[PDB]
């Protein structure tokens, strides 16, 4: 089977449409997401036209083998989609109505700089390589584009499944290629963030600060070092629930600052001691009393600057 | 092969039935479960009818190729099912008796808010896309719906495999679609919950409370901080056995409250000390003696409120 | 091709036999095991019979397409087996000698209640669905059932590959089905159990008991709490080597009791102190001296009761 | 279905070209990377030549079956590529223009000796086995070699996709084989290295050094041992983000030196004590005061030697 | 197509040869290794013989369909190999020259008793099941057996790819089977063993021994228990880099002995104290002074006995 010849110097337009049946398995690491959906295509193959009175039928159904179907592919798929033809329906003028059900692991990039307040746009790029006998351009049939209301992505809000109606046609390896963009907007919904990650991580840091209402260097050391280990222990626990990135996340910035607040604390404790040791206990208690208000206020301000810096 | 024409303006009813052979691989994370089962279908194709005395046979067996079979699919499957035709049997009136054996990873959502007392309902949605020449509606043949007594899901009680006899018919991409709901009820059976998760997590919290029958700030600090690290260490150990959710679980609420009870404890210990340090040892021991009854009773009440709040 | 007609009202018997070539990949979690083996089948198709003098041949070899072969399947397989026909040989009386080489992930349940002294029986269930024209019953040909001497399952002793010659025939979806049971007996061989898991877990518990030959509440606390953390640390280390179950294991029972022996220990230490603190040092040292013999003996007895309870 | 006969004794040159569509899944462990790309090939099969006036066509398009295509393979692929023919175009002189779209997991080795400053060269080796009737040599058509601007490898800078135009021809199993080298240059971009790995690992080491401005052997021990455990705890946390190699990495060298700086520290602390214990408190404080400048300066120099040694 | 008839009562010899292209993915756990290679076969089918002057050709190339090819398989493969025919060449005497490129996950057993000094022999078993019309024996063509110089197995030294020229012919399911053994010798090259695993594990054990140059039971307890936790912590870190076996490894024996050296140490510390407590400080310091030389020397000897015991 060969492409349908053009009556005039015109390209064939293939009216696309993707309906998400079930969208799942979003790999925050691999920047992948698996989607099970419907692809719909329509074009005019005048060779396939018929007289309905003579044929005794209003619409003829054909097997993929039997007729010409355009080589539609995806740019950002891992390996080729696991498609299965659902229906092929030729109207008496030659307007083929194709529908397939596919499932493919897509590769859209993810940004976690604002984690756990991050929001994504998941791309699904449709392409069609123009043949040597006639060029092919894509088009979005807005009716045949949608999503099932039951489509669920646990911990995310599935905002909208839209499509840039504008196909960015370009040249590749001395041939025209028509490219459509299907964008799936999702926004994070991490509820348990504060009780699971921040709130307990804050208490461990606060427990460390009880070393300013103490003067025992033996108690002070246990207090600061022990809480530091408790901090690292808890970080190991929330390793799962955290973004594993080559850049700095919003949450990653907070965690880092907390490591520093342990470091500064130890300095205070060591100073408070070395002053008392060197018999200057005025400046010793002056520094401890200061820290009481200093450490918290500074932390608050720092976390404000920090926050606004990302948002 | 074309669909069977109606006698009048009626739709074709396809009598479904799923028999679970072996149900396994329930991913508590991915909200998936793999199932190996039998799909049975029945409809009336009057073209296929015969006079048994003339044909000399009671039932004729046909190859899938040879006769018309309806395109039945699943909505919530990951990738297409690994089906295989077992038998096709046409009775003398045209009633085709189809049977296939399949295996597919299903996507039903899971709720762990009541963990480890949670109970699920696992959905398997059957669909059939109506042809352009006649519409198709589904039906449940209650007899052909069941499960093998040996079907095992370790740590769960497989309650019932039922089906909502009511097919929710709807319109999609300008065509009718009939949808059936097959629900598999499972309820958790986590026996070792108390000895594996709660009982050792309780002892570690109690060990921390022995700081109210002490007055040594050096011992008190070691006691509370060390048990806090022991708590976090044990949490890392039961990380496996716990639900990894964006919402709060019943168990997750208990764990959180325990983090707080360490925080409050440290405050007590710091207060008991700062009072003794500031030479007010009456209010110092008053607070320690109070906590002895306070901390436990409060914890008990809190865990009662907590419990009833989920149940 | 259609089934071989009976002489009279008798069923066709298909003589089975499975020879394990290589048995591997036993998932203690998923309760699966992968097996690469030979399936052999024999039945009498009198239509296929020949006069060897006329045909000039002793045995005729046929292609699977060419002749009738019974639909043999497995009940507890994950997805369909990766079979490949090795040989089909018809003797002059019609006795077909079929042989295929397959590979399938089986689903037999595992019991770890006696871990690491547990022993399993791995089931491979063979079925054959009776046709509408004649019923089919299975049979074991003891000669064609065996295993390669090189079949290895690391850490297990492959005891015996046997088969219950009795096929449990039953009714399913209005038809007879013959079911054979192929059992593979394996017994655990965990040598390094004592040096890897128990022996170091015992020392950590003993180190904690050196708090009865001490009177320093500062030393006593460090001793008990630190060893408790060491205990939990080591439990995290042997998490791999341990059974992850919703029930109680033999080993899991020991581990739990050890958590309790830390709890009781802390009570002793706190009591020894609170008595010395309240100036009753007779009952203080009496309790410490007692524990010296008490804690060990009690532990021994408890571990005896415990052991006999499972065995 | 036979190769094109040579005009003279010269070999057939097949003009190659790979265009990376989407490059992803770089396994730092398995030394693999998955790539989805276009392979383009061109050669002259004079048998396929035509007179365009007589044939009434400018360019003839053929099915892979219909014409001779050279057996092109990859050396370093895991399993065979998931290729799909996009277009085959024969010009009137016999110049075949082949294009396929493939996806294969490649096996290029990785070197992490300079981690996280490492830079790789990812090899994709193209081969063609010379037939018994005529030899085949490869060639790079620089125009048909490139990459999509959107090709992303998270945490890496995709420098250049080049090809050594020189095909290294050699003999294998008594036949000529032409081998082309496609090199993909990538350089690491680990931004968060200092805040995620080094900076907190440095603070923990510094906290340990506060034992030189102390004289309490009880505090000194807690200080050094606790930080050592905090060190090991943090190493467990950054286990993910680190190279798991049988050789020494740059980072691995730093980590090792840090383990040693804890060891030397403990010696100091033990010495400072044993001197004070043996009533030689001049050499006791002399050693502590020394370490104050010693430990840091030595560490700095050591890390300089260390650094220059890899770079 | 049927097998080539013999001249007399002789068997057909098929000259084998495997050339490793890329050998990778060695699972130390699953005892598997994936290999991408060339399989070459040669036999004499006198039916296929030709007169080169009449045929006008030196060598004729045939499609797998067209001529008879022997059913060669592997014994220790997981699932069937992903083979692809590269070339079939018949010389004028009937000597067929077959070549295929395959990729299969092999199952050879591994021994880690001498870890990280272990050395393996990786088996690839070739078999051919003799037909009912003529028997088939295998043979090694030493020329067609080899490996690519670039074949890499990270952390191992690929010593030699050899083959036992002696095919172990045997009877299975009433038929002859010829079995060839292809052995791949590999020896471990774990360079970073000492700096990554032993050297830091030694320091942690030595840090514990600084309790013999101390008399503070409070310091002594912290010292020994803390280092024990540091030991367990480091063991968790090197869990990756270690062999997960049901038997005892060389390394596993060292680790165990170290657990014991902590146990003995605690006893010393407890004794040194209980003697000083019972006012016998001569035997108290005598035991501490002894241990100073005892513990190290004993450890050295023990590690010598230990070492020689495995080697
Ligand atoms: Cl695609
Ligand atoms: Cl489906
Ligand atoms: Cl099966
Ligand atoms: Cl390839
Ligand atoms: Cl094979």
- Coil/strand/helix, residue D22: strand
Determine contact, residues B59/C132, Cβ cutoff 8 Å.
yes
Name the resolution in angstroms. Answer: 3.4
- Kindly report the length of chain C: 311
Determine contact, residues A200/B256, Cβ cutoff 8 Å.
yes
Neighbours of chain E (3+ CB pairs under 8 A): C, D
How many residue pairs from chains B and C have C-beta atoms closer than 8 A?
Answer: 121
CA nearest to D216 within chain E = E219
| CB contact B237 to C (< 8 Å) | yes
* Cα–Cα distance list, A194 to A232, A238, D94 (Å): 18, 12, 69
All domains of chain D in start order, with CATH: 1-192 (2.70.170.10), 193-311 (1.20.58.390)
* Cα–Cα distance list, C144 to A43, C21, C128 (Å): 60, 13, 18
Q: What angle do CA D234, D235, D237 make, to 5 degrees?
A: 60
Determine contact, residues A39/A72, Cβ cutoff 8 Å.
yes
Of B280, B86, A229, nearest in space to C177 by CA: B86
B9-27 burial: b if 16+ Cβ within 10 Å, else e: eeebebbbbbbbbbbbbbe
C256 vs B200: CB contact, 8 Å cut-off?
yes
- Coil/strand/helix, residue D133: coil
Spatial distance between the Cα atoms of E208 and D263, rounded to a whole number of angstroms: 11
How many residue pairs from chains A and D have C-beta atoms closer than 8 A?
Answer: 124
Token reading at B234: 């044990």
What lies within 8 Å, CB to CB, of A232 at 6+ separation is: D230, D233, D234, D237
* Cα–Cα distance list, D149 to A111, A128, D19, D188 (Å): 19, 19, 11, 18
Per DSSP, helices labelled H in chain B are 52-55, 193, 199-209, 217-237, 250-277, 281-310
| CB contact D51 to A (< 8 Å) | no
Strand partners, E307: none
Determine contact, residues A106/A74, Cβ cutoff 8 Å.
yes
CA A129 to chain centre: 28
- Residues in chain B preceding a C-to-N separation beyond 2.5 angstroms (breaks): none
How many residue pairs from chains D and E have C-beta atoms closer than 8 A?
Answer: 131
Over its C-alpha atoms, chain B yields an Rg (Å, rounded) of 31
Distance between Cα C81 and ligand 3 center (Å): 5
| CB contact E236 to C (< 8 Å) | yes
HSE-CB of C30 using CA atoms within 13 angstroms: 16
DSSP C98-160: EEEEEEEEEE-----TTTTS-EEEEEEEEEEEPPSSS-EEEEE-GGG-EE-TT---TTEEEEE
User: What is the residue whose two structure tokens read 């309650």?
Assistant: B159
Tell me: cis bond preceding A153? Omega within 30 of 0 counts.
no
Chain A residues with CB under 8 Å of B259 CB are 199-200, 203
Determine contact, residues A158/A23, Cβ cutoff 8 Å.
yes
User: What is the residue whose two structure tokens read 């010899």?
Assistant: E13
- Residue B140 class from Cβ within 10 Å (0-12 exposed, 13-18 middle, 19+ buried)? buried
Q: Are strands A32-44 and A18-27 parallel, antiparallel or unpaired?
A: antiparallel
Token reading at C252: 């899991």
- Coil/strand/helix, residue A61: strand
Token reading at E284: 């108290």
Q: How far is D192 from chain E (nearest CA, A)?
A: 22
- Coil/strand/helix, residue D11: coil
Crossing angle of helices B250-277 and B281-310, in 10° steps, is 170
Backbone angles phi, psi at A86, to 5 degrees: -100, -45
Tell me: cis bond preceding B116? Omega within 30 of 0 counts.
yes
Of C40, D186, B220, nearest in space to E173 by CA: C40
Spatial distance between the Cα atoms of A80 and D223, rounded to a whole number of angstroms: 58
H or E stretch including C272? Answer: helix C250-277
Per residue, the 3-state secondary structure of D209-268, as one string, reads HHHHCCCCHHHHHHHHHHHHHHHHHHHHHCCCCCCCCCCCCHHHHHHHHHHHHHHHHHHH
Tell me: cis bond preceding E200? Omega within 30 of 0 counts.
no
HSE-CB of A122 using CA atoms within 13 angstroms: 27
Spatial distance between the Cα atoms of E211 and E269, rounded to a whole number of angstroms: 7
- Residue D309 class from Cβ within 10 Å (0-12 exposed, 13-18 middle, 19+ buried)? exposed
Of E79, B83, E107, nearest in space to C103 by CA: E79
B250-283 burial: b if 16+ Cβ within 10 Å, else e: bbbbbbbbbbebbbebbebbbbbbebbeeeeeee
DSSP state of C195: I
Determine contact, residues A46/A108, Cβ cutoff 8 Å.
no
Determine contact, residues D122/D151, Cβ cutoff 8 Å.
no
Distance between Cα B77 and ligand 1 center (Å): 20
Token reading at B107: 């996507």
Q: What's the count of helices (H) and strands (E) in chain C, helices before strands?
A: 6, 13
Token reading at A286: 């002056």
Method underlying the structure: X-ray
Token reading at C71: 């639909």
Q: Are strands A156-164 and A176-188 parallel, antiparallel or unpaired?
A: antiparallel
- Residue A65 class from Cβ within 10 Å (0-12 exposed, 13-18 middle, 19+ buried)? exposed
* Strands of the E32-44 sheet, one edge to the other: E60-61, E84-90, E95-107, E32-44, E18-27, E146-147
What lies within 8 Å, CB to CB, of E165 at 6+ separation is: E139, E140, E142
Nearest CB partner across the interface for D263, out of E82, E191, E203: E203
C199 vs E274: CB contact, 8 Å cut-off?
no
Q: What's the count of helices (H) and strands (E) in chain D, helices before strands?
A: 6, 13
A84 vs B79: CB contact, 8 Å cut-off?
no
Q: How far is B218 from chain A (nearest CA, A)?
A: 5
Spatial distance between the Cα atoms of D167 and D135, rounded to a whole number of angstroms: 14
Of B39, B38, B35, nearest in space to B72 by CA: B39
Spatial distance between the Cα atoms of A73 and A129, rounded to a whole number of angstroms: 9
What lies within 8 Å, CB to CB, of D81 at 6+ separation is: D74, D102, D103, D104
Distance between Cα D80 and ligand 4 center (Å): 4
Token reading at C67: 């002749």
Distance between Cα B81 and ligand 2 center (Å): 5
Q: What angle do CA B180, B183, B187 make, to 5 degrees?
A: 170
Spatial distance between the Cα atoms of A228 and A207, rounded to a whole number of angstroms: 10
Determine contact, residues C180/C136, Cβ cutoff 8 Å.
no
Chain A residues with CB under 8 Å of B75 CB are 21-22, 148
Name the residues around ion ligand 5, CB cutoff 5 A: E 73-74, 77, 80-81
Chain B residues with CB under 8 Å of C126 CB are none
Token reading at D303: 């890390």
Q: What angle do CA B207, B208, B209 make, to 5 degrees?
A: 90
H or E stretch including E21? Answer: strand E18-27
Which ligand is nearest the CA of E101, by number? 4
Spatial distance between the Cα atoms of E212 and E209, rounded to a whole number of angstroms: 6
B207 vs C226: CB contact, 8 Å cut-off?
no
Determine contact, residues B111/B118, Cβ cutoff 8 Å.
yes
* Cα–Cα distance list, D131 to D13, D80, D128 (Å): 13, 21, 9
Which among E68, E175, E225 is the top mutation candidate for probing chain C, defined by the most C β-carbons within 10 Å of its own β-carbon? E225
Determine contact, residues C37/E78, Cβ cutoff 8 Å.
no
What lies within 8 Å, CB to CB, of B53 at 6+ separation is: none
Of D178, D162, D145, nearest in space to D72 by CA: D178
Determine contact, residues D161/D145, Cβ cutoff 8 Å.
yes
Determine contact, residues E107/E79, Cβ cutoff 8 Å.
no
Query: Count of CB atoms within 10 A of residue E101's CB?
Result: 21
* Cα–Cα distance list, E232 to C201, C230, C232, C238, D58 (Å): 11, 7, 10, 11, 76
- Coil/strand/helix, residue A201: helix
DSSP state of B195: I
Which ligand is nearest the CA of B126, by number? 2
Backbone angles phi, psi at A51, to 5 degrees: -95, 110
Strand partners, B156: B188
Q: What angle do CA A296, A300, A301 make, to 5 degrees?
A: 120
D38 vs A173: CB contact, 8 Å cut-off?
yes
H or E stretch including A228? Answer: helix A217-237
DSSP A204-223: HHHHHGGGGS---HHHHHHH
Q: Are strands A136-140 and A12-16 parallel, antiparallel or unpaired?
A: parallel
DSSP state of B287: H
- Kindly report the length of chain E: 311
Which ligand is nearest the CA of B107, by number? 2
User: What is the residue whose two structure tokens read 């004070």?
Assistant: D276
* Cα–Cα distance list, B74 to A41, A55, B92, B126, E301 (Å): 22, 34, 31, 5, 69
Of C232, C135, C227, C213, nearest in space to C175 by CA: C135
DSSP C196-243: IIIHHHHHHHHHHHGGGS---HHHHHHHHHHHHHHHHHHHHHTTTTS-
Determine contact, residues D257/D287, Cβ cutoff 8 Å.
no
Determine contact, residues C253/C306, Cβ cutoff 8 Å.
yes
DSSP state of A46: G
Neighbours of chain B (3+ CB pairs under 8 A): A, C
Neighbours of chain A (3+ CB pairs under 8 A): B, D
User: What is the residue whose two structure tokens read 């400080």?
Assistant: E281
C246 vs B22: CB contact, 8 Å cut-off?
no
Query: Count of CB atoms within 10 A of residue E127's CB?
Result: 20
Per DSSP, helices labelled H in chain E are 52-55, 193, 199-209, 217-237, 250-277, 281-310
DSSP E253-304: HHHHHHHHHHHHHHHHHHHHHHHHHTT-HHHHHHHHHHHHHHHHHHHHHHHH
Of C126, C240, C110, nearest in space to C186 by CA: C110
Spatial distance between the Cα atoms of A239 and A196, rounded to a whole number of angstroms: 12
What lies within 8 Å, CB to CB, of A28 at 6+ separation is: A110, A112, A243
Spatial distance between the Cα atoms of C212 and C298, rounded to a whole number of angstroms: 15
Over its C-alpha atoms, chain D yields an Rg (Å, rounded) of 31
Distance between Cα C77 and ligand 3 center (Å): 6
Query: Long-range contacts: D275-283, Cβ < 8 Å, 24+?
Result: D276/D215, D276/D217, D277/E215
Interface of E with C in 71-130 (CB under 8 A): 71, 73, 75-80, 107, 109, 129
Strand partners, E12: E136
Nearest CB partner across the interface for E218, out of D2, D80, D218: D218
Determine contact, residues E60/E50, Cβ cutoff 8 Å.
yes
């Amino acid at each position: 089977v060969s492409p349908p010849p053009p009556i005039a110097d015109e390209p064939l337009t293939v009216n696309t449409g993707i309906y998400l049946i079930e969208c799942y398995s979003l790999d925050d690491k691999a920047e992948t997401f698996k989607v099970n959906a419907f692809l719909s295509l329509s074009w005019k193959d005048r060779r396939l036209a018929f007289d309905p009175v003579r044929s005794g039928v209003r619409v003829k159904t054909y097997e993929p083998e039997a007729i010409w179907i355009p080589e539609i592919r995806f740019v950002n798929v891992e390996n080729a989609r696991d498609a299965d033809v659902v229906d092929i329906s030729v109207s008496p003028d030659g307007t083929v109505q194709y529908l397939e059900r596919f499932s493919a692991r897509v590769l859209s990039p993810l940004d976690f700089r604002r984690y756990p307040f991050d929001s994504q746009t998941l791309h699904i790029y449709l392409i069609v390589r123009s043949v040597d006998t006639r060029n092919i351009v894509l088009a979005v049939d807005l009716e045949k584009v949608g999503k099932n209301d039951d489509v669920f992505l646990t911990g995310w809000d599935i905002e909208s499944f839209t499509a840039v109606v504008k196909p960015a046609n370009f040249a590749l390896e001395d041939r025209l290629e028509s490219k459509l963009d299907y964008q799936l907007r999702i926004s994070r919904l991490y509820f348990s963030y504060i009780p699971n990650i921040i709130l307990p991580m804050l208490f461990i840091l606060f427990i460390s600060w009880t070393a300013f209402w103490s003067t025992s260097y033996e108690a002070n050391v246990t207090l600061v070092v022990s809480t530091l280990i408790a901090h690292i222990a808890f970080n190991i626990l929330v390793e799962t629930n955290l973004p594993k990135t080559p850049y700095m996340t919003y949450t990653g910035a907070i965690i880092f600052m907390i490591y520093l607040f342990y470091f500064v604390a130890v300095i205070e404790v060591t100073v408070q001691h070395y002053l008392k040791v060197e018999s200057q206990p005025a400046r010793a208690a002056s520094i401890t009393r200061a820290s009481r208000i200093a450490f918290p206020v500074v932390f608050l301000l720092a976390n404000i600057i920090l926050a606004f810096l990302f948002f």
